[PDB]
Structure 1
Amino acid sequence: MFTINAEVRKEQGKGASRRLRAANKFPAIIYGGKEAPLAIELDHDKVMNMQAKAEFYSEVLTIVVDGKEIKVKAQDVQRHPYKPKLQHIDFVRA
């Protein structure tokens, strides 16, 4: 029953997505439910050492972006190919 934050982001391109990974930020998305795929950025280290808890996935998520919280549950993970930091997470609205 974990608490994270995010900032608003929209990217399609090679130059933009790399300029997150260069600097230790990465993207994720909250699909279905009442609303469209919402693209967000997260931090590398907020999920690695700010947390080493099974609750992120086993329990509901408070996710703050522009004062919004909708309740969310986790979906499949994409991981970096050269470090144990997070390359991308997918999410479904709950």
Structure 2
Amino acid sequence: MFTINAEVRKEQGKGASRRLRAANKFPAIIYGGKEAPLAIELDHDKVMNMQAKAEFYSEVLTIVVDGKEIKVKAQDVQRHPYKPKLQHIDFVRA
């Protein structure tokens, strides 16, 4: 039931990622299977509320990116060192 809307990233690296997080988004990566990895951006507030539910880390999620639906599992999460924020998430294709 967990659905996440995302956009493909058009810029990567340190500067682009810090600009994302200064605009209330954050980067993430989808990998696994045989498809190439896909680098995406998520809205920080929406995902930070969802991941507070323990089932976020156990269920199969759906990431809607450019209309297409992708089934994934949360694999890794980088949290801010001391703020209640998210820096990055790894999603493995399910």
Normalising by the smaller structure, the TM-score range is: 0.7 to 0.9
CA, structure 1 residues 12+47, in 2 after alignment: closer, same or farther (shift >3 Å)? closer
Q: More strand by proportion, 1 or 2?
A: 2
Q: Deviations over 1:48-84 (max 9, x none)?
A: 2356321211110111001111311110110112411
Contact 1:4 1:62 in 2 (8 A): yes
Query: Equivalent pairs: percent with the same residue?
Result: 100
Whether the 8 Å CA contact 1:2–1:55 is kept in 2: the answer is no
**Bigger proportion of residues as helix:** 2
SS at match of 2:70: coil
Compute the TM-score of the two structures, normalised by the length of structure 1: 0.87
Contact 1:4–1:64 (CA under 8 A) maintained in structure 2? yes
3-state DSSP of counterpart to 1:56 = helix
Q: Would the alpha carbon gap of residues 78 and 51 (structure 1) be closer, same or farther in structure 2, given more than 3 Å must change? A: closer
How many matched pairs? 94
Q: How far 1:15 moved relative to its partner?
A: 2.2
Measured in 1, the distance between the counterparts of 2:64 and 2:7 equals 8
RMSD: 1.7
Instruction: Give SS of 2:23's match.
Output: coil
- How high is the TM-score relative to the length of structure 2? 0.87
Aligned-partner SS, 2:69: coil
Gaps of 5+ in 2: none
Residues 1:75 and 1:51: Cα distance change in structure 2 (over 3 Å): closer
